[PDB]
Amino acid sequence: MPHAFKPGDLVFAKMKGYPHWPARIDDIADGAVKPPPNKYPIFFFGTHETAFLGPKDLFPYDKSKDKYGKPNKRKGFNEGLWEIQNNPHASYS
């Protein structure tokens, strides 16, 4: 069965005025800003941006990749698809 979201989960994260985007749940580093309550830190593949998102905006990857894992023209997108398929636990420093 399903559990709660945890650092390392792979997902597609929806944000207003964007397509479902390759993304991961991040850990919080020591000293680093916590997310609001009930939100998680979301690291977007390709663009390398962060955001703070509740589950209603989080589609787990395996289930969803057939729907949302397709090329898109937006900046970062197709890099992002590469990352989540090929090295999704990497350090993108």
- Is 17 a domain residue? no
Count of domains for the chain: 1
- Is 12 a domain residue? no
Alpha-helical (H) ranges within the chain are 61-68, 77-86
Strands 21-25 and 50-53: unpaired
Breaks in the chain after residues (C–N exceeding 2.5 Å): none
Q: How far is 29 from 19, CA to CA, in rounded Å? A: 28
- This entry's atomic model was obtained through X-ray
- Is 10 a domain residue? no
Q: How far is 61 from 23, CA to CA, in rounded Å? A: 9
Q: Phi and psi at residue 57, in whole multiples of 5°?
A: -105, 20
Q: b vs e for 35-70, b when ≥16 Cβ sit within 10 Å of the residue's Cβ? A: beeeebbbbbbbbeeebebeeebbbebeeebeebee
Q: Where residue 54 sits, what CATH number does that domain have?
A: 2.30.30.140
Using an 8 Å Cβ cutoff, are 61 and 12 in contact? yes
Q: How far is 19 from 7, CA to CA, in rounded Å? A: 22
- Is 13 a domain residue? no
What range defines the domain where residue 41 resides? 23-29+37-86
- Is 14 a domain residue? no
